[PDB]
Amino acid sequence: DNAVLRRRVVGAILMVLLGKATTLALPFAYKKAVDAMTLGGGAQPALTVALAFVLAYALGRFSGVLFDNLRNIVFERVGQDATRHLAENVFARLHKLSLRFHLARRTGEVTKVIERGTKSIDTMLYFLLFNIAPTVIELTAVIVIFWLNFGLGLVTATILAVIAYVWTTRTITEWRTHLREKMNRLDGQALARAVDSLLNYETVKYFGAESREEARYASAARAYADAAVKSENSLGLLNIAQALIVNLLMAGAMAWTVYGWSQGKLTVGDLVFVNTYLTQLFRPLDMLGMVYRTIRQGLIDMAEMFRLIDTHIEVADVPNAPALVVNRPSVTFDNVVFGYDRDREILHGLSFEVAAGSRVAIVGPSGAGKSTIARLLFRFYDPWEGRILIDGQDIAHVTQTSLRAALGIVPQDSVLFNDTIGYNIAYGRDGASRAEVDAAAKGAAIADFIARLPQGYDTEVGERGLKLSGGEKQRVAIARTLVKNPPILLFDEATCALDTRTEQDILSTMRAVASHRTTISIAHRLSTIADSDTILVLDQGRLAEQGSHLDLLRRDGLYAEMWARQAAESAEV
Amino acid sequence: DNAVLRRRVVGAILMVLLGKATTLALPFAYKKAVDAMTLGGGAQPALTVALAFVLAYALGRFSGVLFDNLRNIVFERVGQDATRHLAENVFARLHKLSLRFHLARRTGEVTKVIERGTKSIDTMLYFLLFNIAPTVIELTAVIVIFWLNFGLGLVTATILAVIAYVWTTRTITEWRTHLREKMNRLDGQALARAVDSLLNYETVKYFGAESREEARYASAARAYADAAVKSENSLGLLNIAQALIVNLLMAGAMAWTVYGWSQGKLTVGDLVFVNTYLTQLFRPLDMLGMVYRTIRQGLIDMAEMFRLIDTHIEVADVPNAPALVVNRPSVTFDNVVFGYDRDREILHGLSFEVAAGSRVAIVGPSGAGKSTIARLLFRFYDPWEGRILIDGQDIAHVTQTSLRAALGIVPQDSVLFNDTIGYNIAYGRDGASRAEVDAAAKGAAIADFIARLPQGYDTEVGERGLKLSGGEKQRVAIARTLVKNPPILLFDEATCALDTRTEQDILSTMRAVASHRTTISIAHRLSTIADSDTILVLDQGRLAEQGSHLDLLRRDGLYAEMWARQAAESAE
Ligand SMILES: Nc1ncnc2c1ncn2[C@@H]1O[C@H](COP(=O)(O)OP(=O)(O)OP(=O)(O)O)[C@@H](O)[C@H]1O
Ligand SMILES: Nc1ncnc2c1ncn2[C@@H]1O[C@H](COP(=O)(O)OP(=O)(O)OP(=O)(O)O)[C@@H](O)[C@H]1O
Numbered sequence A: 001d002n003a004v005l006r007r008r009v010v011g012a013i014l015m016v017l018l019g020k021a022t023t024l025a026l027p028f029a030y031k032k033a034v035d036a037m038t039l040g041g042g043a044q045p046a047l048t049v050a051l052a053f054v055l056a057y058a059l060g061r062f063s064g065v066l067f068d069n070l071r072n073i074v075f076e077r078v079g080q081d082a083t084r085h086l087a088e089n090v091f092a093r094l095h096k097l098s099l100r101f102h103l104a105r106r107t108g109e110v111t112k113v114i115e116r117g118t119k120s121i122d123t124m125l126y127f128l129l130f131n132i133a134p135t136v137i138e139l140t141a142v143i144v145i146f147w148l149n150f151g152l153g154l155v156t157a158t159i160l161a162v163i164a165y166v167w168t169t170r171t172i173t174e175w176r177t178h179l180r181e182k183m184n185r186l187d188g189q190a191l192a193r194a195v196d197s198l199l200n201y202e203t204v205k206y207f208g209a210e211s212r213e214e215a216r217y218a219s220a221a222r223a224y225a226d227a228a229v230k231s232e233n234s235l236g237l238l239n240i241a242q243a244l245i246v247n248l249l250m251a252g253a254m255a256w257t258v259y260g261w262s263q264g265k266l267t268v269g270d271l272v273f274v275n276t277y278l279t280q281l282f283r284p285l286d287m288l289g290m291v292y293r294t295i296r297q298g299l300i301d302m303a304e305m306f307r308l309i310d311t312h313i314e315v316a317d318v319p320n321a322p323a324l325v326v327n328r329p330s331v332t333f334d335n336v337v338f339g340y341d342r343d344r345e346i347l348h349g350l351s352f353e354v355a356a357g358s359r360v361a362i363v364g365p366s367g368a369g370k371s372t373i374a375r376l377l378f379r380f381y382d383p384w385e386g387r388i389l390i391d392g393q394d395i396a397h398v399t400q401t402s403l404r405a406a407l408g409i410v411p412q413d414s415v416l417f418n419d420t421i422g423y424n425i426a427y428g429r430d431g432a433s434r435a436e437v438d439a440a441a442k443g444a445a446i447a448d449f450i451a452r453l454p455q456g457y458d459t460e461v462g463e464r465g466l467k468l469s470g471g472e473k474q475r476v477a478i479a480r481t482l483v484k485n486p487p488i489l490l491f492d493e494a495t496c497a498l499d500t501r502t503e504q505d506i507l508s509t510m511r512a513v514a515s516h517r518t519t520i521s522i523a524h525r526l527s528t529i530a531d532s533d534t535i536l537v538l539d540q541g542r543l544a545e546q547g548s549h550l551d552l553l554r555r556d557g558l559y560a561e562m563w564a565r566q567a568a569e570s571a572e573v
Numbered sequence B: 001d002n003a004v005l006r007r008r009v010v011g012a013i014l015m016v017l018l019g020k021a022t023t024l025a026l027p028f029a030y031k032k033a034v035d036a037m038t039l040g041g042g043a044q045p046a047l048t049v050a051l052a053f054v055l056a057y058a059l060g061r062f063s064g065v066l067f068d069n070l071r072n073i074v075f076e077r078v079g080q081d082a083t084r085h086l087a088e089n090v091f092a093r094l095h096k097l098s099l100r101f102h103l104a105r106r107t108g109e110v111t112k113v114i115e116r117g118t119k120s121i122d123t124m125l126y127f128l129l130f131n132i133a134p135t136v137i138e139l140t141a142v143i144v145i146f147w148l149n150f151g152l153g154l155v156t157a158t159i160l161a162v163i164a165y166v167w168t169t170r171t172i173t174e175w176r177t178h179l180r181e182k183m184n185r186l187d188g189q190a191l192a193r194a195v196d197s198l199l200n201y202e203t204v205k206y207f208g209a210e211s212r213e214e215a216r217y218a219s220a221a222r223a224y225a226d227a228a229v230k231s232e233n234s235l236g237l238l239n240i241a242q243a244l245i246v247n248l249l250m251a252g253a254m255a256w257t258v259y260g261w262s263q264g265k266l267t268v269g270d271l272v273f274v275n276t277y278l279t280q281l282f283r284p285l286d287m288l289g290m291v292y293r294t295i296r297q298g299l300i301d302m303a304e305m306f307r308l309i310d311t312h313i314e315v316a317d318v319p320n321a322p323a324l325v326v327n328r329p330s331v332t333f334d335n336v337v338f339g340y341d342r343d344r345e346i347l348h349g350l351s352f353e354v355a356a357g358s359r360v361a362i363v364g365p366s367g368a369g370k371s372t373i374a375r376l377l378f379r380f381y382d383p384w385e386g387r388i389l390i391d392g393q394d395i396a397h398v399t400q401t402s403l404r405a406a407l408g409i410v411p412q413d414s415v416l417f418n419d420t421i422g423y424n425i426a427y428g429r430d431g432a433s434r435a436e437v438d439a440a441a442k443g444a445a446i447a448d449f450i451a452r453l454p455q456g457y458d459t460e461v462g463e464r465g466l467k468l469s470g471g472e473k474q475r476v477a478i479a480r481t482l483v484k485n486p487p488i489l490l491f492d493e494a495t496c497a498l499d500t501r502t503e504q505d506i507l508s509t510m511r512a513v514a515s516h517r518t519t520i521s522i523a524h525r526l527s528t529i530a531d532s533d534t535i536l537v538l539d540q541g542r543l544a545e546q547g548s549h550l551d552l553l554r555r556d557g558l559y560a561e562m563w564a565r566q567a568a569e570s571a572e
Helices: A003-041 A045-095 A099-103 A109-151 A154-197 A199-205 A212-258 A270-306 A368-376 A400-405 A421-426 A434-443 A447-452 A469-484 A502-510 A549-554 A558-566 B006-038 B046-097 B099-103 B109-150 B153-200 B201-207 B210-260 B270-309 B372-377 B398-403 B422-427 B434-443 B445-452 B472-485 B500-513 B549-554 B559-566
Strands: A331-340 A347-354 A360-365 A385-390 A405-411 A488-492 A517-523 A534-539 A542-547 B331-338 B349-352 B361-365 B386-391 B407-410 B490-492 B520-521 B536-541 B541-547
Touching: A003 A270, A003 A517, A003 B109, A003 B201, A003 B372, A003 B500, A045 A109, A045 A421, A045 B153, A045 B210, A045 B472, A099 B201, A109 A558, A154 A199, A154 A270, A154 B046, A154 B153, A199 A212, A199 B099, A212 A270, A270 B046, A331 A368, A331 A517, A347 A385, A347 A488, A360 A368, A360 A405, A368 A488, A368 A517, A405 A469, A421 A434, A421 A469, A421 B099, A434 A447, A434 A469, A502 B559, A534 A558, A534 B331, A542 A549, A542 A558, B006 B046, B006 B109, B006 B270, B046 B109, B046 B270, B099 B536, B109 B153, B153 B201, B153 B210, B153 B270, B153 B349, B210 B270, B331 B372, B349 B386, B349 B520, B349 B536, B349 B541, B361 B372, B372 B490, B372 B520, B407 B472, B422 B434, B422 B472, B434 B445, B434 B472, B434 B500, B472 B500, B536 B559, B541 B549, B549 B559
Parallel strands: A360 A517, A360 A534, A405 A488, A488 A517, B361 B520, B361 B536, B407 B490, B490 B520
Antiparallel strands: A331 A347, A331 A385, A534 A542, B331 B349, B331 B386, B536 B541
């Protein structure tokens, strides 16, 4: 499909084909030895035979290694391009996976699987292109030559020996696959435990549990080491068996050649021809058994890695899915029944209406499942029963991209890229201008703060934005979501980490930006949302109350009681 | 350390010597062939030489492969144990590093460096132990036997050839180290970018920026691919140069021997002997080249890892540091000046007293440095000026372990292990019993909730505990700190994501058991902490006000102002 890559692969194949010329170099030494022993010296060609033998041998070895390295240097571009394309596809498809995977994944084992599969595919492609075909050509050439100069019984013996070789290799590989899989699993578990400890370094320091993490990693490492010892011992046993088979076959061949006659067909040269061809045959078959085991391992690793990527995507677009068109940002929950796992149901027929352009609050006790409303509105999961509508359009029947582009959310636990503040803020919109970033930072009340910083927008935030304060991180999230500027805006506990001045500023910003935008604010402090158009009270995953602040307060229900418990702080300390 | 591996390693060395014996066994079989050319054949006496040829050659090759695999099978345990010990030490020292490193690290590149070093130490140890010594033995044996059997010229030529080989290898390695380092840096950067995107999957989905992350990772990957192509091309050039040198040396060695006489310069069998020795001499040098370059690369990589593992730990114990003795859990900040970076200072002479057993709140605007008080109280950093005292004892002069064991913290951003709820709760104390876990879950108001769960304590929380609710996660952190049961307890905005009922229940359950325990609560909502014994107001890193809620409200200071802004009723 690529003319450059085609040409490169053709050149590489020519390079391996030159291996056949290298194999043809040995019969030159055969002929020279035959001449030297048939004339016994005293003739003219002896000086010629010596010079030709030394020159041909040295140049043949040098040309073999030179062609191997030229093949490597010419194929390195194609190999690295294949690795890059595989890595890009794996990354892209890894970002397409469902949220349940990322929420319950273990970084160490998935990283081990990804790297092992990528390296196995690289090695497998390399060996498939550069080992399979030349070894077949060499086997056919050996068969033909052995048929012309060794008869038929010897070629049948060699075929029976390679058949026994294949049978023993298959049996030992079937025995060793279990140990290999156990080793890989233990390695993955060890790396996952180590990565989890590194992610919880702060917790370990808080609880002084360095020794416990070290001990658990040491236990995992000892398990992996024992499994690896077992696997490599089985590999050594396989190699010893294969070498025994090949060496006894070679011994039989040499025995037949010498037993034919003390002088043989040719006194000097027959032994040398046989030994050279048998070296050129034992060197590749001893590695060919390993190459069969390597193809097996690469197949099981491709099957392993591919069994993880693109295998379980919870949310997928329906065929010919149209794009979402939001003319009126209205939200409808129609008898939505949903639970994260079928073991525990979270939402039991939740139904409500959020009018277009209104500011609606969602309150309730902990565990009520408001973040469930936020995640289902974003189509991270699909509800068991009922449906979600935006402008009267089913969320499940519209493309994910348009739906998620019509929604902006300031989540409860926000994560920032390991980059500058300006990058994180401009991440809200592709190619955001500095004027939009400045306007959003003014709206998110970090303008003066960024001005007081030495690097300004170029201030580093570190990994996950932990080099900033909580309020600064929350304001950065608000700023990026304002950069996005979607028609529907969902604040999941936005004003938790904010001080009083920032709290009032962000609240006024939310009230001012609610002009033609629907606003859904999940808050634990009722006073911050008492001015909302409607307040939805959740309890155990059900809509207990709905209405204005005065309406829910007059009903003397759950919202009123909650408002009488929070207001107890100011009335009487 | 006693005979654990000694016998085993001795066996490995024995195997290596047996390999030399095999290498010495082959020329003898050739010597017999020389005899077969001096006796002119025979009816029966030729058969002996034939049988000797077949037996010696076949058994020599089979025994070589068998001894190699036996050496591997006996040394695999030692190799895996060495790799395991190095990995354990690397992990331990990685946990010993300062918090400034972990806060500003990049996971992908550090993980890549660690894994590269882990594989490199194994490969390097194998090649060093099984190539360096046998190649030296073979070179010395070839030198002595040759010197005995040809004179001086060819040994002078061989030593000059090895000197030129070493010089060319050194030059090409010095030229290729730059490309290798650039390739490694690009690989680390690409992996770091990919890991950051995987950590921010949720942000990417929130803003639909999959294409941008894919494009940036593709750019990093193509850069790494170009660097790797250059490095491997230079490697191929080095290999062809080395092979040319060795093959020309072999060719010259054969040419000198043949020029003496057609059958033999000194002895007739010396030419076949020489060519066999040249094969047995090229077999180890083809490994010696890659072993030289691999030892160089492994040393420079492990030094690079250790130059990142041996980075200076900001917080270290003073020599002969005593243990902390907390009889009255009081906290004192004495003119503490500290900033994270010298370009921006955070705390400017902060001084305050938190009495033993009192309930103290820490409030103020953003940037006032309350999380700095929490991080410095735990000695994550050391202050520029001033000091911190616990029960009148300097934090800087006590062991880190006792200090951190005397303090429990529910941080603002809590992280949970990717494990069950019971594991996370019992993590508060080493070997926590089930009764203690139950008592803490009851105190943290998650007992009944866990009872309502299908798996109960065995419910998975996922990575960082994101499979739980915010309030559930905060209460799990509270449960861990209650399991630890320290005399000083610091809540950095702990009860924000809790509803009022659960918050009040937990706080009252604490207050009942809050006897002789210091409580330090950092809160942004003042009304939740108006019942504290004392309230410390911070501004620009200084203690502006201190006192009760009624006192600070009557004083009409900063606390009153902050309390009058939240009290603004926006309800219609
Ligand atoms: N990925 C998940 N897997 C399993 N259960 C989940 C997952 N996400 C949420 N839940 C469950 O759904 C319920 C709702 O929790 P959620 O994260 O919605 O917090 P909330 O109740 O909305 O508010 P708060 O943070 O105050 O508790 C909880 O019981 C929680 O255990
Ligand atoms: N790890 C860090 N590295 C560098 N600078 C930091 C770090 N953490 C915070 N800062 C900066 O220094 C100031 C120190 O305040 P810190 O975040 O420690 O607590 P705080 O000011 O009480 O937070 P809040 O904003 O919740 O009041 C912060 O406002 C922030 O600008």
